[PDB]
Design a protein around this ligand. Structure first.
Ligand SMILES: Nc1ncnc2c1ncn2[C@@H]1O[C@H](COP(=O)(O)OP(=O)(O)OP(=O)(O)O)[C@@H](O)[C@H]1O
Ligand SMILES: Nc1ncnc2c1ncn2[C@@H]1O[C@H](COP(=O)(O)OP(=O)(O)O)[C@@H](O)[C@H]1O
Ligand SMILES: [Mg+2]
Ligand SMILES: [Mg+2]
Lengths: 277, 210, 177, 365, 281, 52, 70, 105, 52, 52
């Protein structure tokens, strides 16, 4: 029966080297996205210093977008924003608004279908296949724009460092229905900005909020990618420690089983010999 | 007959009756362990004879926690509800805080999730672990021990991070009135007449930690 | 009119009532920015700060004294205490000047903003420098653009954008210093 | 027929036959003797018949503690009232030489068999650590001119253990409910003395070390202890079906433990997180604070009725209490006390403070 | 999946508490139902020998056989653990002699050696007490000849000698799924089949806990009911394709939506092979 | 373990060897494809700790 | 190569072979640590993959051909 | 090694010096004593060793102490048989070792 | 008391108890014989004691 | 897995200190000067403690 614990040591040791390889993979790929996230952080400040930050608005129809990962080696990432989806979708509902939950990533449809399926319409997958590109963001934004909600909420994890992943709600409002309505403070705080558009303000704000949605969704599915590499890094160095301690315990049990088998089969020989002569 | 060897050796450590002199005898058998296995032959033989255990873990000794008492596996159920009761007031709370620290240290083998109230447990347990450990060949009497565990199971020591408790224990031993030590020794327990003094003296302490 | 008192600091207390208390409040993009709109000042002479942006890169964030934006009513220059502006730009060249040095960047179409604090936020998709563009295949690109003329309004819009973009590239490649 | 014991994991997963044999398999520090003292404190008072406690090679101090318990609890009455007593101790504890530990089980069995045959009443034979009888015979058998068998034991182990253990059974004239601790030698269930002892016990309750390492007391392994009364012809279909449900969930958790150790609970699907959450709740819920363990813990012991076991365990199997956390099921009596502890557990998470003033600790009172 | 023909030694091996005896008793119980339907010549007369079992267990089985009516056809050779080791060494042999009368005279016989791993212990006691030198683990080397002299007596004779048969059912108790034990490794090579029962399948709901990857019968589909051969010929394949698709999906990694069906199809089959305590179908 | 994978006969493809596997005895085109099949099966065996 | 050692060492090695075998076993010792990473061939590090392909150069270099003494 | 202890004891007690000793590979002294105690017909102990392992190793290691005359410091190379510190030869060795010095590659 | 052997690492980190026992976990080619010879030379040069 | 220039200033001073301590634990040995040329240096203990 001593052949089980040796092949189990063989299995756990190569699992340990697998995760010792994939911690290298994830911590490497966290850095090649780090030359792009702070660059993709460039267009997220002008819109919020222009439009403000107004999440808790009584929208009539709203598309909340919870962008998740592709491969399910996340480690406190996908289910985190899955619970954050209902936690930021429940404080916003007070009068029964239309809600269109959209999940980006293959690990979104596997988890968000359980809690909110009746308000679940779009599941965008294979988005981190090659890399993240802006025209992909424009296309998914247009596929949200086919419907005409009154607001948007974008649930994504802000990659600040390799330890802290605070999820964020990026807010995108409807241009004439709610965006210009929320700026009404003693007139309009937007009218001090002089328009330099072709047509009126009412259809340049449409272009502005479509660009805002596309930019912030691009930033969301880049920051979730970089925090996914960071969280797979933080999860593959716990599997390495786990397959280190499991290998240590199984090596101790292999040594104890080795000593027990050699002592028992030696006792067998001595009991066979002294009961003969 | 190795079990009979250790049995007839250890079974003579008794607390005799009041008609047979009232004497006693306390054993302390020390069993060498190889790679910390409790499931040996000699270890599991002597555990089924002895009235308790004091498990000394190798990993806790390597990290500078000396003595390395594994408080999870170390049980002695004849001495609890037979001990010095002034210790036993705060010692049950100490057991709960050490058990909570064991549980949350197992739940956080690496620091990634912060709940800001479990961090109070992870602060208190690393405080109490630093309070309980001591230097070699240094006996501490029970009256200078009840005060040092009283001033740590409660507050009065959270002002240091974790570090200078090695100065703070001898600091609170020095800066209390040594009259209260005679009271806590002779009385046996922390009376409210001494509990209010113990709360009173513990706030005027010149603690070297800030 | 504005009957919804929203906000990031108000969202903390309305988040504390329905969600369970064990979780930290999620963050907002207002916490990741410090250069605001109505924060008065931020001019300090002739050098006004310029936030030149791009989705995939950041090409300039240092301070300039003149920026010329190819707006749809024409190219117009931005000074220190400029007017608050929401400007949709034509496909053309933006002109980055810090003083005696002048660098010119061809932009592909995208908005540009000035806020009341004198800071600018130039927000364009593809900001191609004039050293990496060619003057050879632009005439062939216009010859492709001046050929395919079907009846679809979608193709008419994309083809007219092609004509205007390629003609702006020709005008911004032939008259170079 | 059923024997109601008042322990949760015992009455649910391996219920004891009133006319059968009861085994406790322990590995030096898992608490088979504390479990048998709680089994005494539950059964031997309500079960009005005579009881025989034969200590075979356990600690002498525990024999003296049992004597000082059974004197002041009215089980043994001394002086002029020797007739009212309900227990007879036969004590061959571990200081006696291995001749004397090799027959003191037979002495306690003869005292039980006189109450079975001639008196004709139902006897509770509480044999303490019957493996020490095999140990004393093995120590003798090294010198008796015999050959050593497997691991170190007697050649005549099986027929000796049979010749003891087939006496302790319930005849047409009397009944002997036998509760025996069986010390496993070195956490080694393939050892021939526990391997022979498994075949003789009607309702084996195996105590493990790993479950004791998680603090779950009593540390009964719920997936290896079984009975012959765990069958839908004697206990009704609801109890058997809830028992098979809780064993199914625990077996699925013990399957998932490898992937939980390597990867964690993050990698698992949501139905498997449901199974793991239910399994942790029913794994802590088998724990209870004992009435004999209150001498070293301060927690008051709780007797759990069989209907409350079936109510609580059926509820946590179907999902009536999924909202409660894990710690609400730790060291609790039954499902009323679970929600009572969930009330206490919630309450202290905020009210933790405010003791600075209005104390007696001013100087002048 | 492991069909049993008349003249086959089929081994019922498990852990301590699996469905070992109960899957044997169902073979005896059902021979009340068949023999009340088949003619006189093809009647099966069961013999259940008990080696080293508890004497209360044997009084339960004769309570059970007289409760269902199986005692009309069953001999019950009890070698309890009160009996000395020279009795439990002998009782599988003498049970076979009481069963070989039915193989002598043209009828069909059935014998179930309960726990032959306790016959080897009762042979280990005498051989270590007659001063024979121990070999493996304490057993003398001829403990294979202990069982091979016995299990090879179960045979289906030829048509000139009466045409009888005798189906064996040796029962073997392992420790922890230790099929590498010395006593078990003898009997697995002797018997034509193997019905290996596992305890971690027994608590997962599979009752009988037939570890269907490890249960084979060398007599095979030549000796089964003809209606079940054409039908269940894909059954052992459909359970075979259940295990490796359940050996991959356990991590929570990925589904293929068609191998999700072949894992679902095996799940309608895994719950299909469960049966009750004393139920003959 | 090959028999449990259903390959009948359950011949272990790696550890089955022969002295008739020398290319100067049986010709090289047999030994090349045999060592190729052995190499491909050994790569699959080294990979099935990661495919698993 | 990771287990098979000569306790004499390179002191009685053929010179000229000693000039090259010390670098050979050094790259092979780096190879056996960067071994079991060839299955993640899509993920490079551009230097661990260089020593990985050089270990694949040298490990397939030292093959023999069945009574071919060189 | 007892001859080595004798020449070291003459350099310690008579010459009054501070003597070093080098027991080369104490596991082979364990193996030689195991061979002479399996040779004479004594019943072998745990994993394969002599029954007199502890006392006939302590007969060697306990002449290696300080004395009021001089001292003997011995530097014994220790080899672990299966690289297992639960093995009884390093378990009975390491209860005498005072300072270990790991040499690395 | 301590034995000053002269090496910095075995006098600083893991000191040599004068009169005690020392364990070397050596190997091949790691310079164990050079370590032995230097220990002998240093102790015979300084402490006035021989070696065996 | 992160990079050489990644760590903070509180640690990389200790990285330099350990990388100059670990080479400082070496010593020229007098018995190896017959084929290394450099003569050995016997080090006292108090000098080792102070200079470390
Ligand atoms: N088909 C079945 N369905 C449900 N329960 C079963 C089935 N078969 C057996 N059991 C239960 O499993 C338990 C063990 O069955 P069984 O009597 O075969 O055990 P065993 O291995 O024979 O034990 P031992 O070998 O020690 O006699 C019994 O309590 C029985 O009620
Ligand atoms: N219900 C319980 N509550 C708390 N502790 C328990 C309980 N049951 C057993 N224990 C612990 O198990 C330990 C060993 O119990 P005991 O039965 O005396 O050991 P053994 O099983 O070796 O006789 C005791 O120290 C006791 O603390
Ligand atoms: Mg006990
Ligand atoms: Mg059976």
């Amino acid at each position: 029966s001593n052949q089980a614990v040796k092949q189990r040591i063989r299995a756990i040791k190569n699992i340990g080297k697998i995760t010792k390889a994939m911690k290298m993979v994830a911590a490497s790929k966290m850095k090649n996205a780090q030359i792009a996230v702070e660059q993709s952080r460039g267009l997220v400040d002008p819109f919020v210093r222009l439009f403000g930050d107004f999440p808790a608005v009584n929208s009539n129809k709203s598309v909340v977008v919870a962008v998740t990962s592709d491969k399910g080696l996340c480690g406190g990432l996908n289910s985190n924003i899955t619970k954050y989806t209902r936690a930021t979708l429940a404080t916003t509902e007070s009068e029964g608004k239309d809600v269109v939950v959209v999940s980006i990533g293959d690990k979104g449809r596997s988890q968000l279908t359980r809690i909110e399926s009746q308000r679940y319409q779009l599941a965008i997958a294979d988005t981190y296949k090659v890399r993240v590109t802006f025209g992909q963001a424009s296309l998914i934004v247009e596929e949200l724009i086919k419907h005409n909600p009154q607001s948007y909420q974008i649930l994504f994890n802000k990659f600040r460092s390799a330890i802290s992943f605070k999820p964020t709600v990026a807010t995108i409002l409807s241009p004439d229905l709610l965006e210009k309505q929320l700026e009404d403070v003693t007139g309009n705080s937007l009218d001090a900005y002089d328009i330099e558009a072709s047509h009126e303000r009412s259809d340049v704000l449409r272009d502005l909020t479509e660009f805002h949605l596309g930019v912030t969704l691009y930033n969301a599915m880049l920051e979730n990618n970089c925090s996914e590499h960071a969280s797979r890094m933080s999860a593959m160095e716990n599997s390495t420690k786990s397959a280190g301690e499991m290998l240590g315990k199984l090596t101790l049990d292999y040594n104890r089983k080795r000593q027990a088998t050699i002592t028992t089969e030696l006792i067998e020989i001595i009991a066979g010999a002294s009961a003969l002569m | 007959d190795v079990f009979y060897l250790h049995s007839r050796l250890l079974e003579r450590a008794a607390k005799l009756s009041k008609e047979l002199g009232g004497g006693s005898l306390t054993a302390f058998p020390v069993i060498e362990t190889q790679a910390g296995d409790v499931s040996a032959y000699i270890a599991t033989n002597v555990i089924s004879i002895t009235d308790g255990q004091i498990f000394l873990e190798t990993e806790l000794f390597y990290k500078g926690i000396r003595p390395a008492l594994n408080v999870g596996l170390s049980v002695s159920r004849v001495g609890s509800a037979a001990q010095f009761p002034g210790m036993k007031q705060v010692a049950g709370t100490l057991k709960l805080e050490l058990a909570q620290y064991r549980e949350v240290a197992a739940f956080a083998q690496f620091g990634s999730d912060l709940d800001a109230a479990t961090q109070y447990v992870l602060e208190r347990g690393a405080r109490l672990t630093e309070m309980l450990k001591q230097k070699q060949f240094a006996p501490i009497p029970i009256e200078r021990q009840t005060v040092a565990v009283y001033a740590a199971t409660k507050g009065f020591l959270d002002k240091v991070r974790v570090q200078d408790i090695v100065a703070a224990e001898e600091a609170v031993i020095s800066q209390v009135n040594p009259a209260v030590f005679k009271i806590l020794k002779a009385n046996g327990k922390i009376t409210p007449a001494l509990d209010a003094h113990l709360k009173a003296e513990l706030r005027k302490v010149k603690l070297p930690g800030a | 009119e504005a009957a919804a008192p929203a906000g990031p600091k108000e969202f903390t207390e309305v988040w504390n009532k329905k969600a369970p208390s064990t979780l930290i409040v999620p963050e907002f993009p207002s916490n990741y920015t410090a250069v605001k709109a109505v924060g008065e000042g931020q001019v300090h002479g002739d050098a006004f700060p310029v936030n030149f942006y791009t989705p995939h890169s950041i090409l300039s964030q240092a301070q300039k004294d003149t920026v010329v934006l190819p707006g749809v009513d024409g190219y117009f220059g931005v000074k220190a205490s400029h007017v608050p502006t929401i400007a949709q730009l034509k496909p053309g060249v933006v002109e980055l000047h810090s003083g005696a040095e002048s660098e010119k960047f061809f932009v592909s179409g995208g908005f540009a903003f000035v806020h009341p604090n004198g800071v600018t936020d130039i927000c364009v998709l593809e900001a191609a420098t004039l050293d990496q563009v060619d003057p050879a295949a632009v005439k062939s690109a216009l010859a492709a653009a001046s050929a395919a003329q079907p009846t679809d309004e979608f193709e008419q819009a994309a083809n007219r954008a092609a004509i205007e973009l390629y003609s702006a590239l020709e005008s911004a490649v032939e008259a170079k210093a | 027929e059923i024997l109601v014991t008042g322990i949760k994991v015992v009455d649910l997963l391996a219920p004891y036959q009133r006319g059968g044999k009861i085994g406790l398999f322990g590995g030096a520090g898992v608490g088979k003797t504390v479990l048998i003292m709680e089994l005494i404190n539950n059964v031997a008072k309500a079960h009005g018949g005579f009881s025989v406690f034969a200590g075979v090679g356990e600690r002498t101090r525990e024999g003296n503690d049992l004597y000082r318990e059974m004197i002041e609890s009215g089980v043994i009455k001394l002086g002029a009232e020797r007739g009212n007593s309900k227990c007879t101790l036969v004590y061959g504890q571990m200081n006696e030489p291995p001749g004397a530990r090799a027959r003191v089980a037979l002495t306690g069995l003869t005292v039980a068999e006189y109450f079975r045959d001639i008196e004709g009443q139902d006897v509770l034979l509480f044999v303490d650590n019957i493996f020490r009888f095999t140990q004393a015979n093995s120590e003798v058998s090294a010198l008796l001119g015999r050959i050593p068998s497997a691991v170190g034991y007697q050649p005549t182990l099986a027929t000796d253990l049979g010749g003891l253990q087939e006496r302790i059974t319930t005849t047409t004239k009397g009944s002997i409910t036998s509760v025996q601790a069986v010390y496993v030698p070195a956490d080694d269930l393939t050892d021939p003395a526990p391997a022979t002892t498994f075949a003789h016990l009607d309702a084996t309750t195996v105590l493990s070390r790993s479950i004791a390492e998680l603090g779950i007391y009593p540390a009964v392994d719920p997936l290896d202890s079984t009975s012959r009364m765990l069958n839908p012809n004697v206990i009704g279909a609801e109890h058997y079906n809830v028992a098979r449900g809780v064993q199914k969930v625990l077996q699925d958790y013990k399957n998932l433990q490898d992937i939980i150790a390597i990867l964690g609970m993050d990698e698992l699907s949501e139905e498997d997180k449901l199974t793991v959450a239910r399994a942790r709740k029913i794994q802590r819920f088998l724990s209870q604070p004992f009435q004999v363990a209150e001498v070293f813990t301060g927690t008051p012991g709780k007797y759990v009725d069989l209907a409350d076991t079936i109510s609580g365990f059926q509820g946590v199997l179907t999902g009536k209490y999924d909202d409660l956390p894990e710690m609400a099921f730790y060291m609790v009596g039954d499902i009323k006390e679970v929600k009572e502890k969930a009330d206490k557990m919630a309450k202290d998470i905020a009210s933790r403070k405010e003791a600075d003033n209005k104390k007696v600790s001013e100087e002048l009172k | 999946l492991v069909p049993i023909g008349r003249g086959q030694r089929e081994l019922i091996i498990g852990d301590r508490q699996t469905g070992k005896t109960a899957v044997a008793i169902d073979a005896i119980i059902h021979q009340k139902n068949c023999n009340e339907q088949v003619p006189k010549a093809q009647r099966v007369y069961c013999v259940y020998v008990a080696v080293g079992q508890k004497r209360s267990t044997v009084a339960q089985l004769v309570k059970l056989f007289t409760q269902t009516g199986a005692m009309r056809y069953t001999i019950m050779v009890s070698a309890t653990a009160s009996d000395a080791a020279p009795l439990q060494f002998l009782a599988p042999y003498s049970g076979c002699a009481m069963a070989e009368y039915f193989r002598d005279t043209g009828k069909h016989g059935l014998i179930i050696y309960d726990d032959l791993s306790k016959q080897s212990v009762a042979y280990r006691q005498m051989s270590l007490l007659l001063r024979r030198p121990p070999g493996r683990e304490a057993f003398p080397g001829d403990v294979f000849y202990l069982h091979s002299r016995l299990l090879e007596r179960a045979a289906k004779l030829s048509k000139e000698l009466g045409g009888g048969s005798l189906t064996a059912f040796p029962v073997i108790e392992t420790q922890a799924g230790d099929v590498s034990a010395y006593i078990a490794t003898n009997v697995i090579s002797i018997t034509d089949g193997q019905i290996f029962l596992e305890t971690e399948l027994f608590y997962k709901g599979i009752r009988p806990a037939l570890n269907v990857g490890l249960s084979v019968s060398r007599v095979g589909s030549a000796a089964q009911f003809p209606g079940m051969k054409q039908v269940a010929g894909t059954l052992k394949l459909e359970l075979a394709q259940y295990r490796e698709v359940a050996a991959f999906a356990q991590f929570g990694s990925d589904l293929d939506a068609a191998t999700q069906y072949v894992l679902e199809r095996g799940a309608r089959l895994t719950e299909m092979l469960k049966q009750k305590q004393f139920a003959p179908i």
